[PDB]
Design a protein around this ligand. Sequence first.
Ligand SMILES: Cc1cc2nc3c(=O)[nH]c(=O)nc-3n(C[C@H](O)[C@H](O)[C@H](O)COP(=O)(O)OP(=O)(O)OC[C@H]3O[C@@H](n4cnc5c(N)ncnc54)[C@H](O)[C@@H]3O)c2cc1C
Ligand SMILES: Cc1cc2nc3c(=O)[nH]c(=O)nc-3n(C[C@H](O)[C@H](O)[C@H](O)COP(=O)(O)OP(=O)(O)OC[C@H]3O[C@@H](n4cnc5c(N)ncnc54)[C@H](O)[C@@H]3O)c2cc1C
Lengths: 450, 449
Amino acid sequence: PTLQRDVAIVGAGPSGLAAATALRKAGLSVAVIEARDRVGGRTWTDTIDGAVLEIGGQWVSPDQTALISLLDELGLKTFERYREGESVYISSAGERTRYTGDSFPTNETTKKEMDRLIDEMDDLAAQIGAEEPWAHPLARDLDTVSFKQWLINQSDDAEARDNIGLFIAGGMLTKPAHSFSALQAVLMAASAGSFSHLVDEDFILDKRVIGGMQQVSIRMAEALGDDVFLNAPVRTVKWNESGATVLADGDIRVEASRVILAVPPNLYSRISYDPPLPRRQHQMHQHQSLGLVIKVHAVYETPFWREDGLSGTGFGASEVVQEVYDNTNHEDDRGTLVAFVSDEKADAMFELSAEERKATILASLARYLGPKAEEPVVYYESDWGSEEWTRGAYAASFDLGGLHRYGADSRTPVGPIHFSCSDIAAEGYQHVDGAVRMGQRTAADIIARS
Amino acid sequence: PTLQRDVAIVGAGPSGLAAATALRKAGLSVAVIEARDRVGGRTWTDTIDGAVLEIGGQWVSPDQTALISLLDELGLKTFERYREGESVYISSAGERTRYTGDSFPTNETTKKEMDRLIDEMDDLAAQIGAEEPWAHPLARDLDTVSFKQWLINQSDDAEARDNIGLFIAGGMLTKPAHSFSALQAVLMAASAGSFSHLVDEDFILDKRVIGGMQQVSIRMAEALGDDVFLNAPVRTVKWNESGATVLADGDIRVEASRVILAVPPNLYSRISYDPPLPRRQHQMHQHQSLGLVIKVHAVYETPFWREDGLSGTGFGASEVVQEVYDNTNHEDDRGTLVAFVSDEKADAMFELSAEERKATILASLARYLGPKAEEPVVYYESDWGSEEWTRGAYAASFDLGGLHRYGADSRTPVGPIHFSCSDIAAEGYQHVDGAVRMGQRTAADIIAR
Ligand SMILES: Cc1cc2nc3c(=O)[nH]c(=O)nc-3n(C[C@H](O)[C@H](O)[C@H](O)COP(=O)(O)OP(=O)(O)OC[C@H]3O[C@@H](n4cnc5c(N)ncnc54)[C@H](O)[C@@H]3O)c2cc1C
Ligand SMILES: Cc1cc2nc3c(=O)[nH]c(=O)nc-3n(C[C@H](O)[C@H](O)[C@H](O)COP(=O)(O)OP(=O)(O)OC[C@H]3O[C@@H](n4cnc5c(N)ncnc54)[C@H](O)[C@@H]3O)c2cc1C
């Protein structure tokens, strides 16, 4: 079929759907064209071996105000993650200690080093900000030193530097600390409101949506009706100063005034542009890449850790699994754990056989919470790296030096072509809240233009 | 058209063509499918305002034995870049000094610092090698420190550091030194035979091809006749354990036992694979990127610098133009300069208007060679970044950390899909010679079974 719209939107993830919804609200007509047999992108709720799981993005923090309004507008409610009782910390030397409150139970030197670093990171984030971190006069020096090297320049305490890295490198950017810059650590902190917010799992991992995060996309898409096309990878964008024509599988053709690429940046060159994008985009898009993380799901007869006085939360920068949390579904009698295996530790697990990998990850949940972690009734690993329409998790970031070099260009339109995804967001960078903000910002930009 | 072939080859650059050439000798049949209206890829000879220029790759060094051997087989000869008389050095203090001989005319202390850093890089390259630098016991620590931070650790002398950087960062990888690892520097050095080989423009930039480097591809492609398809971007590869179908524009459909992707790695995902490549390829390919450099060409009625006793060679790590060389065509009476503006300096020139960029570049050329450099008869800038089928220059390298993490996987086949370009080569990495070696290494693999 051939259609005529004011805006063609490539990608029916939360970012494209939020842009579509805002455009519709303002009276513009839209078509959203999606590759997969479903909407939601990196958010997805599925049933595996009888257990309902969130395969992707799921948590809402209190600074995610754009996602919180959108939830309210769609009739969706939240619930809080279980946090009663003791958390577990595993030290660099391998000592396992139960604790409550909000510092790790390390020796005092380490604790004071961590506090000081948290404070320095909060300070940098408040000064530099998430809107245009590259523009600050401190930015050049921060963007040309790796986060690993910057931590070495700040502190002699190995354990403190490893735990600070746990929160940014394994915990957010899903890349090793030697491979992105101090500035990129600052941006990640600023985007979430402060580094202290990313440190406190009670803040950044506070709530979930009743019915799952994918419902945010599913409900936006339901309201768009026949203007959403599924099973339709977009292959070609033909453009000029006044116009873009978008071509997709199934003989789909959309003639639009503007196009929104609502896809992560590592995937822009999956589409052919006629004429080609300018040199600056050709170069910039090469320097953007997704991290890699395994999101592990483990379902048990009950949340057994709660009988032992444990919250289910566990941190260990030297473990294969660096984080574990209670991920029990709203009103479920069965318990579910969630755990994360990050970057180079993920590659290492994927090189083991499926059997050996499972055994290694369950051994590690057992190190945190006890030998009952070893007996789930359902076990599943989210595998976003294999998915050709994602190719990693959670989200994309520049290589080292790319944030200062290309950051000012990452949202600029090219003629009628706009860009919108969480991976180029300011507040809410990498999160559904960022996807939502960017979709709304791109919509408002198009509306003013037209 | 639909055709059957033993091997379908995507890309008619030197790597694809060298592979097709080797495959035919064994009696395997081939189709070589090429996006552009020409062969050669990053090699290309063109005529701008009536003056002939090598828009891309052009120089041959004595360690480039796969290339040299191929030139002989194709009946092509070489000539040497003019090098008589004095070179020019521009110091960090902006001081300009004519010199000859094998080191920069700096003070003795800076000279000792440079020498020590060159010996250190030679030693690392000799221990580590180009074949699998990631497997060496020193590899992890070299690959997690940037080259800039490694230089800072080795030497406190900023002029000596910037000068070593000139040869590797602006001069090869065309990325700034804070963005790639020490191990990647060591690779670049091992791949050319040593770091000293890259410091000596009389080695790395020794010879050119009579008739132009593009002739290497042109001749190879001529011998293949109707098995080369031009103006045919490949869009899809459908594959299983025993075979592939390759689909290109113009309704080309090639059914084959093996496919070679003879394209730089930042372009692999311009193609759809059915079923998708595995996760490890999905990830690795995102971590590969081309550098950026403006190859500047300036043509004058004579090689005027030779009249002032200058070789045409100039170096200055702080200039916008960090290098200038005599690039006079074989038996032309007109003189031609070649010059390079690398990485973030290229981004900054591209941000000015064309007129202001040209004046800024020619001002810098004038500082090396005199006010005559500012009145060329023909001026041209190679723009590979704008080409959708290249998108940068000279070649691709990992981001920081990628070489150790992914290196061992960069040549591995996926089922019947093989990978062959200069950007994944061992010896000859990033150069025509590496493209030839990889093309021949891939063909030998497929041939042997
Ligand atoms: C395991 C995991 C855990 C995460 N944790 C959370 C968390 O707890 N909280 C949170 O808020 N965020 C989290 N995130 C991140 C969050 O899911 C993403 O930031 C957000 O989904 C990004 O949305 P987007 O619309 O910007 O891109 P995406 O959701 O990736 O959507 C892009 C869409 O475009 C489609 N597409 C791509 N190319 C084409 C093409 N050529 N043609 C047609 N369609 C195309 C894709 O199929 C996809 O549907 C997590 C993600 C993962 C994977
Ligand atoms: C400014 C510049 C200066 C250089 N300096 C030197 C030097 O002097 N000496 C030296 O040895 N090397 C030099 N190089 C590097 C050298 O030219 C490259 O190493 C070499 O050409 C690599 O050859 P290749 O076959 O691996 O890839 P390429 O030459 O890039 O060829 C790949 C081919 O694939 C085609 N292609 C890509 N995608 C598709 C697709 N989907 N479908 C069909 N076709 C496709 C492209 O059009 C291209 O023709 C220079 C390069 C440049 C750009």
